[model samples]
Target: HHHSSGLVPRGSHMGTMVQLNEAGLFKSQGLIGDKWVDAENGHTLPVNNPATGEILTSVPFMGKREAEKAIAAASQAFTSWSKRTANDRSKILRQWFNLLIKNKDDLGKLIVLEQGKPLAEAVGEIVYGAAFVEYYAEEAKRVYGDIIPSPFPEKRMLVMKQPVGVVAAIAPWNFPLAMITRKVAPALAAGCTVVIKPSELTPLTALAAAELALQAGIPPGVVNVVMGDAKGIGDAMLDSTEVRKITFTGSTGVGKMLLAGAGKTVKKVSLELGGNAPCIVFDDANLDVAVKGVLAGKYRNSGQTCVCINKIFVQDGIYDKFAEAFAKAVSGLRAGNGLEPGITQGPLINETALEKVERHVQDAVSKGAKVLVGGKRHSLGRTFYEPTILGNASDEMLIFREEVFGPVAPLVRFNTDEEAIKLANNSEFGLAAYAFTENITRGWRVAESLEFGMVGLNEGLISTEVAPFGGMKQSGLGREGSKYGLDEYLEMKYVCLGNMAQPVG
Candidate 1:
């Protein structure tokens, strides 16, 4: 018998649950070879509720040994899995996507507990992430090999696409489910096997998804999830002879190290690294609309997103108008626990992130920046930092130079389109950028002029399952959406059939 108090028997260590939806969680879990297993070494890492200062639960820790097993299982599975017809692969992948949708709400709640994004955003990520799988599910049928005419008039030349082989994907903690699904879905849809190492901070969501995958009839060994030390597990993956490809989403510094190691094996690598995106507002832009775009782009995920607007450049004509509206808009934002109703923003991922936000804001203030609103941490809790907006910030400040990865917006004044372009492109990182302009001609001009790989013009929503997502320069290599994403998990081969003469009756 269960009480109507929105509480149930302790599902995990999270007992006396305040929300009915928080029930039905297992205290311990990990996924390996289609089975939910615990850490072989019995070692665990404590996962905290970033919104609250409590130890939520411990995640099983798997090290190099488990890493080797995952790699081996994936290697063995690739042999037969890769040989499956594209339609067959597509069918299975579609089923996996279907299951994801059916469980979207549950997954969203888990994300709220572990990753700390808003429930709606978390559900949105699942939907966004699932679209990639659904797309590639159809794309599998359209692999589209090429047939070429032969010079000899007798031989036929052809190009074929095949799975790249076993892949190793490492996802970040920010978008716990999407990051894993974004990589795993493509690998599976491409007829390749994968060994996934989700970030130690949040592995529950990934494990849960993999479990559902098994229920969806995804074969054992086709997908595996292991958790542990990044360096140790990653090194094992790189050392394996069977891991032919590596896809990662995280910091540029770590991506470089992983790239260097994978280089030893000549593995195919796709990296989505850090971003210091610039949000440019021209003088002719609608101040009200631009204010909304800035609020949405800069503060989403509490500004922990890779494409979070790091720099804001407004032309001198409407700079004052834009600043007033933007600051007032910033002040109205309510930041708190993601699960709480009506909270626009949530806590920073951890204390280090809080400190980083502090450091950057202080550095900006010391260099003569003005705080329009939210200059310090919120009284709500220790993990929460107020949504901060800075004015007159110059490049000398750390906030101007580094990736803030927090809810801090630094506004800089600019004069012209050329000047905005110069200031926006003046960063070492170029993952994504946003520009708000009414002139459609200028929209294309700014979009074309920006150095970032992805851009949003007069709109804050730039990410989608069908469009390509990646960065140029130090932001990282390759792409992760659209048909191009599937290509990341595939390799092309050339075939020639010769020595036959055409004979027809």
Candidate 2:
């Protein structure tokens, strides 16, 4: 499968350039009805292309007034939306999915331009993002209840699920469309109204998605998109009593802040926070398979992934062999403009991210870690960083303990499975973990022992439409996939009805 041509085609880069004029680009306007108007503050923030570090556009920066409008809109729409049958919600979602499929190419291009991932990867994300909406559309009709046996002959108890209320969904920069869809699809499937706050870094796609949602016949105010910072817009959403549920995806620090804010109102909250995932390679595992897995886990999106393997723990037996192979594989990766053809890895999203990766590398080297391959930063007049790997890595290094969120993998050796497990579980994060072992018993033990919410056994990729994806501990609060996702936007109601004519028990 890896033999499909390692070289990017030379002339495949030419394409019709699409420009967003003032009218076509997103406006910092509140969507109360069918129209877009300015926020109460009438201020805007510049959206930049992270790869090129160029200002793409300036859209509205929402404040408390705009947030209140959105919250009120959602509150007004919730009663009617909740009363609709599950089939109605499912139909709307199906239409939304179909719209996404039809416009995927254009949307994917926007994602690449705004988010800085490779074009192919952005296209893949678009396809995957639509899958969430499609999956939840079908799941809407399947939200079943439980029946409890009654002690009396003529009595019965029925437990039903109801839409909680208006949901405030705050999505992050990475995987913008998918993260937004992951929360919105399930919330809307459960007939809950939503107010979405897309990250200021990439608000275009989120606004475009909201437009598509409108095209799918989503009622006005049922879905709203506001773009701004935490203090400006996010705080308003969290502080509002009308907003019943909060779904967020971002760093753990911000998640903690939101948790504290949500505590005051006792509102339901779900967070998909930061991760420092570990990829463990055991001695008995297939070397080729482990190498391939490592490549997929680390280099995808140039290692800017949240669940990307931050640290590698290789058993001493295969440590040298795996290290050499991994170094060669990473050194061979091609990095350039995401829109450029044959570019497998893109830039680090922005200048700050690039600086952070550089600092992490320098700090690790200063702490006695040795650079195995690709340690230097690439200057394409952009934010591109070399695919870096470090040997002799220790927990004291920031890269080993913190989330690097870049195209660097720091390797460390382990003598036994116990030591590997201990090293892997030594962090505050528990988002995801990876293990490659042919031994069934070892795989079972690792899977059970690992503290992460999701684990990949012999596989590097773990995200799926059916699987529940979230982290344990500081990684996050609730799961976001399949029917379990629906629970985040719903509440349980137990009803008991009996005939009074029958004698009391």
Candidate 3:
């Protein structure tokens, strides 16, 4: 049941009524030029609670026209924004970061309602999301310049960095808040303005953040949010000469499409795309530690993360033990409404996501894999799939080839280190990989040899604000986070001064 006052509505899910401390946080309008406006035609798109299939709220169903307006606004704002001292921008971003931290609970609640992750994980996402802003806020002041001696004694060379200009950031629905922050924080920190398109699936969290941005005293037109018409909006971003850079986090197919479109305009594009990460457990690894690490990496966000373990390769010597231990861990995950206190796993994003999980499981079973635990949908229904563990997962199965993007963990047995490395590197995607080994030499060798952008040895979670996150191969382009993330939004400039001999005077 839900009740509404004005444009914002407070909804109750499973007998719990949730409301934000700041009512204005429920922004249904597109933030264009610092004004909350509806779609030009007054069209709106509903944001559904994936767990219950309930309509949370609707946002402006904007298209090319609105996208262009946002682009123009950002371009116009870029002039002043780029000129503002990095210190000033740092202060504002810090305020925004503080606001995010202060409102973590509400933001987490919004994430649960829309994106369907557990409340605790959702809140952790808020903290993780805010960390990017916090990091880049300080990084803003650290954008250093360089000076070099010229070929001649009378000449000198200087190098400086400048903002790349209006950025169009497209963030996916998973980790809605954090994904947006990682992109926007660096762009803003680099003195560039942004026009953001948070996934239509989870737009409320973004719109609410826009409200907080305003509260943080971020100038009008500096940041904007638009929803609807993914392709049309993407095309508008590509066609616009004012839009200088495009950062996206989504599928490989879509990332390729955006890359091709950006090529027409030669826009600076960075994509965090598809991944098929492999987690390998060596025979000598600590069994308990390996099991826990794999569980964290695989089940986080119900295995929807780009870095989540797709294929689990355990050495033949420890295959049976790891499989037995892992299945027991998977069995213990409580799947239900995210708002519920003890729920560890929540529903898949939608029907399509649920079907993909089902199809992968069916494909694996037909190909001689054994269901160690959970191989069907949960009784709670409506996008809820049980946390699954399939033994004997082979390269022939679809789960081994494609991203299941659900709570499915498939174990593949490998005989030697060479074989494990070979099996992990077989995939075209090279986003992230994991290995657990007590042998330092083996750990070092495997970490270095894995054909991926980032690797974890004896560790499960690798994502952090201090490190770079991206992919190689078809996984997608350039990195985000760390110092590299700021570089994506800046252009280098070189100036040479000549004929400066003191004796000439």
Among these predicted structures, which one has the highest lDDT? 3
Ranking by TM-score: 3, 1, 2
Could you tell which candidate, 2 or 3, scores higher by lDDT?
3
Candidate 3: clashing pairs of residues: none
Candidate 2, 95-179: lDDT as tens digits: 9999888887777777887788988999899898999999999999988999997887788789999999999999888897898
Q: Output the lDDT of residue 186, model 3.
A: 97
Q: What does the lDDT read for residue 172 in candidate 1? A: 95
Question: Can you give the TM-score per candidate against the true fold?
Answer: 0.95, 0.93, 0.97
lDDT of each: 0.86, 0.85, 0.91
Residue runs of model 1 more than 4 Å from their true location after superposition: 1-27, 502-505
| Residue 400 lDDT (model 2) | 86
Residue 369 accuracy (lDDT) in model 3: 93
C-alpha RMSD of each candidate structure in angstroms: 2.9, 6.1, 2.2
Q: Assess the local accuracy of residue 39 in candidate 2 as a C-alpha lDDT between 0 and 100.
A: 61
Q: 225-278, model 1: which lDDT tens digit per residue?
A: 888778989999999989999999998889999999998899999999989988
In model 3, how large is the Cα lDDT of residue 312? 92
Name the runs in model 3 displaced over 4 angstroms. 1-11, 14-18, 502-505
Better of 1 and 3 by TM-score: 3
